[PDB]
Design a binder for this molecule. Sequence first.
Ligand SMILES: NS(=O)(=O)c1nnc(NC(=O)[C@]23C[C@H]4C[C@H](C[C@H](C4)C2)C3)s1
Ligand SMILES: [Zn+2]
Length: 257
Amino acid sequence: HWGYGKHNGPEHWHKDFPIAKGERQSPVDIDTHTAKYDPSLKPLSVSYDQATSLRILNNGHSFQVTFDDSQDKAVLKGGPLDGTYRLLQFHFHWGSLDGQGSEHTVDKKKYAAELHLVHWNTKYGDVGKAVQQPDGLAVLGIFLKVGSAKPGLQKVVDVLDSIKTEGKSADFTNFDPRGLLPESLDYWTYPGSLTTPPLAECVTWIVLKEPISVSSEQVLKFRKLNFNGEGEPEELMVDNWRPAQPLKNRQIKASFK
Ligand SMILES: NS(=O)(=O)c1nnc(NC(=O)[C@]23C[C@H]4C[C@H](C[C@H](C4)C2)C3)s1
Ligand SMILES: [Zn+2]
């Protein structure tokens, strides 16, 4: 089964998921001098006031926080998007050292980690149907750099000890994801894919220009998680990022000059 190691990592995924070599794969390097400002792009609308978080879970490739998506409660609209996209979950990708960990890069620069808030287009009724559509999902990507602590991340960090190994979950209600956002909603956008299997080409990517800062103590707690299940040889969950893929016939648009 797939992972991030030498024998099951990103260079192997195409054998089970041939779309790994497809025409709109993610992540990509964002070349800031080639991205074009698009004045027709509307402001992003992030409406998280009624978000209802449910659980936090170690799924063997990251940890994720899941939300109630049975109603319009936490939604993303505007920007490049048509219609309403409901927040399903967020998760992170991170590195073994501070100089790597992000999936998207900016002028080849790698950040220490990357937060992905995963949303799906309500016109398709459920997320499984949405993943089969070219406009089915919208992922809001936020870079993390190491510096001052991010207070809105601390409640997450606090609970990671309880989900150390694959399969573990914990109650994670009343979490406000607005605490994970930077000040600015300036963004780049391009059509892409899921960055883990099945690698489906169903995502409108919205990558925020402004990173959030997290403390060294916060990211160190990410690095104490395990890929393995309890009772198996301990393999630290680090470097769970897919590298940049070919841009091919795609243009990255910027919301800002
Ligand atoms: N790293 S990223 O944000 O591009 C993501 N890469 N893969 C992701 N997968 C999902 O989000 C799913 C949401 C539900 C349906 C598909 C089957 C399970 C269930 C998970 C997809 S997000
Ligand atoms: Zn992701």
